[PDB]
Design a protein around this ligand. Sequence first.
Ligand SMILES: [Ca+2]
Ligand SMILES: [Ca+2]
Ligand SMILES: [Ca+2]
Ligand SMILES: [Ca+2]
Ligand SMILES: [Ca+2]
Ligand SMILES: [Ca+2]
Lengths: 48, 113
Amino acid sequence: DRTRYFSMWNQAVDSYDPDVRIIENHGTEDELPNYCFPLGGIGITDTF
Amino acid sequence: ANTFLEEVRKGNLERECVEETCSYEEAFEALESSTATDVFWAKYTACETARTPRDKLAACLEGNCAEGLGTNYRGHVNITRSGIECQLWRSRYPHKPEINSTTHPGADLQENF
Ligand SMILES: [Ca+2]
Ligand SMILES: [Ca+2]
Ligand SMILES: [Ca+2]
Ligand SMILES: [Ca+2]
Ligand SMILES: [Ca+2]
Ligand SMILES: [Ca+2]
């Protein structure tokens, strides 16, 4: 086998990431929104 | 003017053009009633010496006191210093005023105040 690494002889095969040479672009899952809120919870306010 | 994110909040005529040096735009925006807008402007102008502190500007909004030479006074006193009756500013009796209602409409020239 060649996948395993042996340190003594510096034996480590070099390979490329499978998803970098050939891109499988399926888009992304973004059905729901995604909101950033205000620290206090209520942003603006008034007086009453 | 300051606190940049003020233009997204609702505003207070007193939290923009009173407790702060304001734009007549935000003043215009908040007022629209251009007659009282001119009034508030007249205020600001006369209150140019009443910009600070806040209660000084509140009193200058009340208008019972004359500021400096008396451009802002809006009371009910219509008598001379010595009790002589005040002549109507617009009327020509007994003198035709070169300086009258037409020349100074922004001072809110009352009957004889
Ligand atoms: Ca402001
Ligand atoms: Ca402002
Ligand atoms: Ca503020
Ligand atoms: Ca505005
Ligand atoms: Ca405003
Ligand atoms: Ca206030």
